[PDB]
Amino acid sequence: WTIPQLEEVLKRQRAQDRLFAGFLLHNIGTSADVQLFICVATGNGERN
Amino acid sequence: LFSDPERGEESFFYRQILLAFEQRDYCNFEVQYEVTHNAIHSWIGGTS
Amino acid sequence: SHCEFAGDIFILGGANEMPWEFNLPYHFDISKAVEHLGKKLNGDYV
């Protein structure tokens, strides 16, 4: 891809709707990784 | 006609004209030739 | 995670009370609660 098609594909991927999650990173003293786990409500409400 | 962001320096029909020039036999030259004329007809014609 | 309420127990304690320790485990009925959960009595649960 070059600049024209890149910019219009960026525009067309901005056009629709999407959801983000926001983190506030800070130094922790060692490199690591973090996993994202969403939880769906149940009948009892417990995070099954 | 003026707004083809497919690439920043090459037109829509340039690829077609080089492809039509590539082959050697005259029948296939014609069969690669007519499409540029037809596409310009469709483009500049409008829906009138 | 199907969990349901089982029952109640009351313990009496006071500021000036002799330290009391039972000499035998105490038994409570929870068969109805397990039946409500639907698992068999000799099955499994927590």
Nearest CA in chain A to C5: A44
A5 φ/ψ angles, rounded to the nearest 5 degrees = -60, -35
Nearest CA in chain A to B3: A4
Angstrom distances, CA of residue A26 to CA of A23, A45, B48, C12, C26: 10, 32, 63, 50, 52
Relative orientation angle of helices B12-22 and B26-45, to the nearest 10 degrees:
160
Q: Does A42 contact C1 at a Cβ distance shorter than 8 Å?
A: yes
Closest by Cα among B42, B44, B40, B24 to B32: B24
Is B6 in CB contact (< 8 Å) with chain A?
Answer: yes
Residue with tokens 């320096």: B9
